[PDB]
Amino acid sequence: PAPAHVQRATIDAFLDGWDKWTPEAFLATWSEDCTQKTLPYSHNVPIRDRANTNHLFPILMSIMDNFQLKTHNIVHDAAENKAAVYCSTTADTPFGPYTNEHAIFLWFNEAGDKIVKIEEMFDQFTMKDFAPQLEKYAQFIDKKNARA
Amino acid sequence: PAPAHVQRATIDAFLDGWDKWTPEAFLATWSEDCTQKTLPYSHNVPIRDRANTNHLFPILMSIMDNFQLKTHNIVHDAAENKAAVYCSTTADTPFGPYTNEHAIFLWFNEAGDKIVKIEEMFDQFTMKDFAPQLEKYAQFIDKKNARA
Ligand SMILES: COC(=O)c1cc(C)cc(O)c1C(=O)c1c(O)cccc1O
Ligand SMILES: COC(=O)c1cc(C)cc(O)c1C(=O)c1c(O)cccc1O
């Protein structure tokens, strides 16, 4: 398992790419197989593969302006090649103001330079309203692109 | 900062006491001024202090029958005297079946033997229904006890 400071460097580049709020910046630290699973398991939100998130994040970021990320807690388990962060976010969306908070579990690859698995719990009351707004927005971008 | 194995021992006792589901077993790792904070911050849930916890847990535990804890993930940051765990639970309650899942952030005291701060995010759809039900059930116990 890679040295702490290398994993920690991956964590920071993930958070900074998140704050930078472009697809390429944020997805730079995700491996090709990195899955994102929404917790709790009981909410039955299907795990999301990399083709899914590569298609979502451009659309998602385009409808969140003044995105500000705030990191409250980094728990680094260098021996286990693992981490957990707590973050909060705000943005303006086509649907009104957006706020969220995130408990995020990360796993790194052997080299400690990519994130390989993501599991996350968020503000489910924010998401109950926003996920369907986002899904219909995504479908509208899809249809609009296929036409042209 | 205490050695990693001593901090890990408190984690293991915390989860084992939780599993054993008695006020004494679970609380043995809680420092005497340890606070419990519900995330997200945006839901503005007041800190539960140790006295609140000591009154709540005997009632709460008494209406959760067949309680089962499953631990999914332990993120230990010995260098920062911190940790994060992910757990899920089931039980039978007088309000029907119960399921919950917890992303818990733990801080230890200097000795690494007590837990000093708890911040957790849970299944907010469980808690939306359960929390008022437990609050009314707790008031009823306090009333029934007073008049004896
Ligand atoms: C800020 O947005 C992110 O890129 C994001 C990133 C991470 C690591 C977890 C998330 O929960 C989100 C998210 O907020 C989100 C969403 O709000 C709607 C659909 C999918 C998502 O991933
Ligand atoms: C299983 O119960 C616990 O002792 C418990 C314990 C921890 C570490 C987090 C919790 O969220 C709970 C809880 O589930 C709970 C509840 O369901 C209602 C009121 C207070 C609580 O702490």
Side-chain angles (χ1 to χ4, degrees):
Chain A
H5 75 111
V6 172
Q7 313 180 15
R8 186 51 201 253
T10 294
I11 299 173
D12 301 335
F14 172 93
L15 298 172
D16 290 353
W18 193 355
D19 189 70
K20 184 142 154 243
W21 200 238
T22 70
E24 328 86 50
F26 185 32
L27 295 171
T29 56
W30 301 38
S31 78
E32 279 86 0
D33 282 345
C34 181
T35 50
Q36 182 176 347
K37 166 64 166 171
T38 290
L39 301 149
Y41 296 108
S42 67
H43 289 194
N44 295 315
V45 184
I47 185 158
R48 249 201 191 101
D49 69 26
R50 199 51 222 280
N52 193 313
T53 59
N54 295 343
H55 165 261
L56 189 53
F57 283 11
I59 293 168
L60 186 38
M61 287 169 172
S62 76
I63 69 178
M64 281 204 173
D65 215 56
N66 203 29
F67 181 79
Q68 324 228 57
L69 166 65
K70 201 181 306 271
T71 306
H72 304 299
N73 189 10
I74 295 167
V75 201
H76 191 176
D77 194 325
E80 301 293 324
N81 211 32
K82 269 161 15 162
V85 306
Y86 196 76
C87 297
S88 66
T89 61
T90 68
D92 300 314
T93 83
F95 312 103
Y98 165 98
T99 71
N100 212 345
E101 298 185 26
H102 302 263
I104 303 170
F105 299 89
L106 301 169
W107 289 259
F108 318 116
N109 60 0
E110 291 222 341
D113 70 315
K114 301 300 203 24
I115 284 145
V116 152
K117 183 165 80 149
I118 307 173
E119 298 178 356
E120 51 145 353
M121 197 168 227
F122 45 54
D123 187 338
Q124 298 137 35
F125 292 155
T126 286
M127 227 54 219
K128 212 243 277 184
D129 299 309
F130 178 63
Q133 299 163 327
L134 168 57
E135 178 65 23
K136 295 176 178 79
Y137 191 97
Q139 305 189 348
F140 160 86
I141 297 295
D142 285 357
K143 283 182 96 144
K144 207 172 102 149
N145 288 338
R147 268 169 73 271
Chain B
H5 75 265
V6 153
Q7 295 172 42
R8 192 73 164 64
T10 314
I11 299 160
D12 289 327
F14 181 82
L15 303 168
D16 200 46
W18 197 357
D19 195 22
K20 189 215 166 193
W21 199 240
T22 65
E24 307 92 23
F26 187 32
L27 278 160
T29 36
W30 296 45
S31 99
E32 55 197 29
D33 298 288
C34 174
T35 55
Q36 190 180 3
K37 171 64 166 170
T38 294
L39 310 167
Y41 295 118
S42 59
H43 291 188
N44 299 315
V45 182
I47 284 163
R48 222 152 202 130
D49 80 351
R50 183 54 200 274
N52 189 348
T53 320
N54 290 327
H55 170 261
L56 193 42
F57 278 21
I59 298 160
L60 171 66
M61 280 172 178
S62 93
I63 64 172
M64 276 175 143
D65 187 61
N66 193 25
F67 176 82
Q68 312 201 300
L69 176 71
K70 179 177 175 112
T71 307
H72 297 274
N73 192 4
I74 302 208
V75 191
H76 190 174
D77 192 323
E80 301 296 336
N81 203 34
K82 277 192 312 205
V85 307
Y86 198 75
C87 309
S88 58
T89 63
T90 61
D92 299 303
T93 83
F95 314 106
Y98 170 95
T99 70
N100 213 348
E101 303 185 23
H102 310 255
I104 301 143
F105 295 86
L106 305 168
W107 286 265
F108 318 106
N109 61 0
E110 303 141 2
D113 65 327
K114 294 298 222 124
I115 274 162
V116 152
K117 204 174 145 113
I118 302 182
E119 296 180 345
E120 50 155 330
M121 170 168 285
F122 45 46
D123 185 336
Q124 295 135 43
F125 297 159
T126 294
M127 296 315 279
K128 194 74 164 201
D129 302 323
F130 184 61
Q133 293 162 329
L134 174 98
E135 182 208 11
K136 287 198 216 31
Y137 185 100
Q139 279 156 0
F140 164 79
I141 291 317
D142 294 344
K143 269 195 246 236
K144 205 169 69 166
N145 285 353
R147 258 165 47 228

